[PDB]
Amino acid sequence: SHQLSRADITTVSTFIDLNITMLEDHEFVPLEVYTRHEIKDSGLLDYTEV
Amino acid sequence: PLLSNTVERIKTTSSIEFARLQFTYNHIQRHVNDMLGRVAIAWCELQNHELTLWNEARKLNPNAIASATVGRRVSARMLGDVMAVSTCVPVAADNVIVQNSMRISSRPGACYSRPLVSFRYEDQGPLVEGQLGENNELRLTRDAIEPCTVGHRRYFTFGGGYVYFEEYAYSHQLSRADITTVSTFIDLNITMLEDHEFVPLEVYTRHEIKDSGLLDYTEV
Amino acid sequence: SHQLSRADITTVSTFIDLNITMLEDHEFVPLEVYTRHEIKDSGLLDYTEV
Amino acid sequence: RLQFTYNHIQRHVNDMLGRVAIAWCELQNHELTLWNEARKLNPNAIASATVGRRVSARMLGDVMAVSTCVPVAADNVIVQNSMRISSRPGACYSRPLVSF
Amino acid sequence: ANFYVCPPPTGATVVQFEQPRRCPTRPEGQNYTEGIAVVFK
């Protein structure tokens, strides 16, 4: 009769799917609550500058 | 909050490492839990899917399937939609002798397709004739007969090795390593995480920060 | 001869077991070797208070 | 604190991945028997997939004789139209006849 | 390398394969709300 392309016939899946996703690259920036300076300035008086 | 179109004084800690550690732990935990849940789901589906192949394997050769599933070397026969199973008994390797020729001396044109064997249950028991089987098993009835054909070379399992038969005649024994093996296993390589040690490390110590000051009132 | 329940006949496992459990949630509480108040109080004398 | 976090994650991963490896091992050792039975039906396919190339094979008891096949170009094959046997009506071919 | 001899089986002992289990379902997933924030110390 004739020939047929492979895609012309319905394909049923005989495979089991596993969707493994990678862990994304991340960056940590320098973060701090109070800098060394802020702590120095927190004092009411400084002997050196006085 | 945003949506897409579709009296007391509070004290704050000086260190923020706990929040960063919480973020790191949460991110890692989410990734590992998601991936491992997916793997568990896939395993369950794969086993449920392979049950279909087992349903037919139990029909093609009941003995091997019963042996691999039940947990011990047994002989089974399919008896409808179930398997009738029986636990069967071992026999020592040295108490088995193979006959040299498989030819039938009384019926020309008919040859035994399996090697004939003589075995004894105990070291002092009587001699029992029988037929060899698959994966070192012994058949009591000699029924495997086929028309005799030229070009007959065969290998059979025997103990830890093979026996090779030439033209319905005994040729010799062979070690297992003598025949090249193709791998029927898919390889999966996993190595563990190495144990690591974190040492105390600081950019500036307490003493260096104290020394940074130009004058100290106490010392002066 | 008769009928039988499914439970009446012994079953052998055709399945391979994979017992993967989950990782637990954790809480990181605020932990401090020394509070900044303790570090300030470590000094013998303070110019401001004196 | 970093020691604690690293350790905790290490235990979890090194346990679960080991379990996965063990389960893979058992799965392969458990599928070997299905291989052992399917190889009897169409030995060519199992031999081809296992050995590493398209190979014809035939069993010799508990082993199998092996031979590699020769490639043939697609355009050098012509299919005859009819499977009818011109001398024996009532007998037909099951697979297409070819000239290569 | 130990041989075996096996009598023909009988209906005395009957065994069946297990029926499929129910695979576990994925968790729903945390419901996250976007926003813009300011942190005060």
UniProtKB/Swiss-Prot annotation, chains A, C:
- UniProt subcellular location: Virion membrane; Host cell membrane; Host endosome membrane; Host Golgi apparatus membrane
UniProt's post-translational modification comment states: The cytoplasmic tail is phosphorylated by the viral kinase US3. Phosphorylation may be linked to a down-regulation of gB expression on cell surface.
Q: So which residues have sugars stuck on them?
A: 19
Top-level taxonomic group: Viruses
Give the function comment from the record.
Envelope glycoprotein that forms spikes at the surface of virion envelope and binds to the host cell entry receptors MYH9/NMMHC-IIA and MYH10/NMMHC-IIB, promoting the virus entry into host cells. Essential for the initial attachment to heparan sulfate moieties of the host cell surface proteoglycans. Involved in fusion of viral and cellular membranes leading to virus entry into the host cell: following initial binding to its host cell entry receptors, membrane fusion is mediated by the fusion machinery composed at least of gB and the heterodimer gH/gL.
Task: Name the family the entry cites.
Answer: Belongs to the herpesviridae glycoprotein B family.
The annotated subunit structure for this chain is:
Homotrimer; disulfide-linked. Interacts with host receptor MYH9/NMMHC-IIA. Interacts with host receptor MYH10/NMMHC-IIB. Interacts with the host coreceptor PILRA. Binds to heparan sulfate proteoglycans. Interacts with gH/gL heterodimer. Interacts with gD.
Name this polypeptide is given = Envelope glycoprotein B
Mapped onto the parent protein, the portion here is 655 to 704 of 903
